[PDB]
Amino acid sequence: KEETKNKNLEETNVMKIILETKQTKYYTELEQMNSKFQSDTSNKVKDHQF
Amino acid sequence: ALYQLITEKLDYSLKVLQEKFHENNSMCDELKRKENNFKNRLKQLTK
Numbered sequence: 001k002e003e004t005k006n007k008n009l010e011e012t013n014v015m016k017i018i019l020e021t022k023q024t025k026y027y028t029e030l031e032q033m034n035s036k037f038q039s040d041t042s043n044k045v046k047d048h049q050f
Numbered sequence: 051a052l053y054q055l056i057t058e059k060l061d062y063s064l065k066v067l068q069e070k071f072h073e074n075n076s077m078c079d080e081l082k083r084k085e086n087n088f089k090n091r092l093k094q095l096t097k
């Protein structure tokens with residue numbers, strides 16, 4: 001009864017953290033690209049307005 | 051794709067609008083000279 005929980009939790013956590021390291025590898029560009037658009041586009045917007 | 055094309059569109063639009071602003075300023079000062087000339091023509095006519 002103890003062993004069932006032991007193996008389940010151990011393998012589950014190993015897989016969870018390993019796949020978490022795999023997954024967390026993918027995102028860097030969304031917010032940065034948006035912000036780096038508006039940062040140099042605010043002056044253009046003000047030009048348009050005025 | 052949404053970023054680069056729109057930013058280049060706006061960078062060209064800046065020139066597009068500034069051209070018309072400069073030409074509007076030219077038409078405005080030519081209007082100023084024209085109205086001044088008409089008013090001075092009236093001045094001389096009355097004299």
